[PDB]
Design an enzyme around this catalytic site. Structure first.
Site, PDB file in Angstrom:
ATOM      1  N   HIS A 109      94.693   4.802 -10.808  1.00 17.04           N
ATOM      2  CA  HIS A 109      93.774   3.721 -10.487  1.00 17.04           C
ATOM      3  C   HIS A 109      93.689   3.562  -8.979  1.00 17.04           C
ATOM      4  O   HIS A 109      94.717   3.492  -8.293  1.00 17.04           O
ATOM      5  CB  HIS A 109      94.246   2.406 -11.112  1.00 17.04           C
ATOM      6  CG  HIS A 109      94.002   2.314 -12.581  1.00 17.04           C
ATOM      7  ND1 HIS A 109      92.768   2.009 -13.110  1.00 17.04           N
ATOM      8  CD2 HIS A 109      94.840   2.461 -13.636  1.00 17.04           C
ATOM      9  CE1 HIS A 109      92.850   1.982 -14.428  1.00 17.04           C
ATOM     10  NE2 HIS A 109      94.099   2.248 -14.773  1.00 17.04           N
TER      11      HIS A 109
ATOM     12  N   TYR B 161      95.100  -7.117 -14.147  1.00 13.39           N
ATOM     13  CA  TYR B 161      95.329  -5.947 -14.978  1.00 13.39           C
ATOM     14  C   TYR B 161      96.421  -5.051 -14.408  1.00 13.39           C
ATOM     15  O   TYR B 161      97.444  -4.835 -15.076  1.00 13.39           O
ATOM     16  CB  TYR B 161      94.022  -5.151 -15.165  1.00 13.39           C
ATOM     17  CG  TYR B 161      94.224  -3.931 -16.035  1.00 13.39           C
ATOM     18  CD1 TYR B 161      94.507  -4.065 -17.393  1.00 13.39           C
ATOM     19  CD2 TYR B 161      94.186  -2.654 -15.492  1.00 13.39           C
ATOM     20  CE1 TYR B 161      94.713  -2.962 -18.188  1.00 13.39           C
ATOM     21  CE2 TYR B 161      94.402  -1.539 -16.285  1.00 13.39           C
ATOM     22  CZ  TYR B 161      94.660  -1.705 -17.634  1.00 13.39           C
ATOM     23  OH  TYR B 161      94.879  -0.600 -18.431  1.00 13.39           O
TER      24      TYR B 161
ATOM     25  N   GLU C  24      99.613   5.991 -13.484  1.00 13.20           N
ATOM     26  CA  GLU C  24     100.069   5.550 -14.792  1.00 13.20           C
ATOM     27  C   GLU C  24     100.117   6.714 -15.770  1.00 13.20           C
ATOM     28  O   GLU C  24      99.441   7.733 -15.604  1.00 13.20           O
ATOM     29  CB  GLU C  24      99.140   4.464 -15.376  1.00 13.20           C
ATOM     30  CG  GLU C  24      99.086   3.186 -14.582  1.00 13.20           C
ATOM     31  CD  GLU C  24      98.107   2.184 -15.167  1.00 13.20           C
ATOM     32  OE1 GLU C  24      97.438   2.504 -16.178  1.00 13.20           O
ATOM     33  OE2 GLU C  24      98.018   1.072 -14.619  1.00 13.20           O
TER      34      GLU C  24
ATOM     35  N   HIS D 118      96.909   9.261 -14.833  1.00  9.38           N
ATOM     36  CA  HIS D 118      95.665   8.832 -14.211  1.00  9.38           C
ATOM     37  C   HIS D 118      96.008   7.889 -13.076  1.00  9.38           C
ATOM     38  O   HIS D 118      97.048   7.221 -13.093  1.00  9.38           O
ATOM     39  CB  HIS D 118      94.690   8.194 -15.218  1.00  9.38           C
ATOM     40  CG  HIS D 118      95.244   7.012 -15.949  1.00  9.38           C
ATOM     41  ND1 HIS D 118      96.069   7.136 -17.046  1.00  9.38           N
ATOM     42  CD2 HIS D 118      95.091   5.683 -15.740  1.00  9.38           C
ATOM     43  CE1 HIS D 118      96.408   5.933 -17.479  1.00  9.38           C
ATOM     44  NE2 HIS D 118      95.823   5.034 -16.706  1.00  9.38           N
TER      45      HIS D 118
END
Length: 174
Positions: free
Chosen positions: A83, A141, A72, A81
């Site tokens: 995830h 999310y 992202e 970054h």
């Protein structure tokens, strides 16, 4: 499921050190339900794809693991970054960080000039334990992000292999 989760930061130094191997890597990416991937966005998508391919056939603690990786970039963010949601019978709180870092850095090694490596930060509970809510975190999310806020996504989890790079499905999930 009981999947771990955490984040690898990608500073702008990483992209500044990208070498010819990374800039010239040619890999097919299905952006037919996505935004076009160019410049350093495409480098990050290529990188994530290469990491997943490595993981798909790796032994040791990572053998047989389920994973979901999402790179992202937010507004005002420098770099990226990543995830990471990951779990498997060989992964435990004592080896999680070294195993994830080793996987990502073994691939990155051939793509950057110099001793440039990523670090993994596990997501932790109020009580100081590693989270094991990874699959709910994907649903609540990570899947609610749309490109190019989410730049790319790779997974081997059944419920997401067909939607992980669907901008359409992601848009409806927000």
């Amino acid at each position: 499921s009981e999947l771990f989760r955490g984040v690898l930061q990608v500073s702008s130094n990483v992209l500044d050190c990208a070498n010819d191997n990374w800039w010239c890597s040619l890999l097919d990416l299905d952006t037919s339900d996505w935004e076009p991937l160019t410049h350093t966005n495409r480098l990050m998508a290529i990188y994530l794809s290469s990491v997943a391919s490595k993981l798909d056939f790796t032994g040791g603690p990572l053998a047989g693991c389920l994973y979901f990786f999402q790179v992202e970039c937010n507004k005002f963010e420098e770099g990226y970054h990543i995830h990471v949601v990951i779990g498997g019978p060989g992964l435990n709180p004592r080896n999680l960080t070294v195993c994830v870092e080793g996987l990502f850095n073994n691939v990155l090694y051939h793509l950057v000039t110099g001793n440039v490596k990523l670090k993994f930060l596990p997501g932790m509970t109020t009580k100081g334990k590693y989270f094991r809510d990874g699959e709910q975190f994907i649903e609540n999310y990570l899947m609610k992000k749309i490109p190019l806020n989410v730049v790319w996504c790779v997974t081997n989890i059944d419920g997401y292999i067909d939607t992980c790079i669907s901008a359409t499905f992601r848009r409806g999930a927000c």
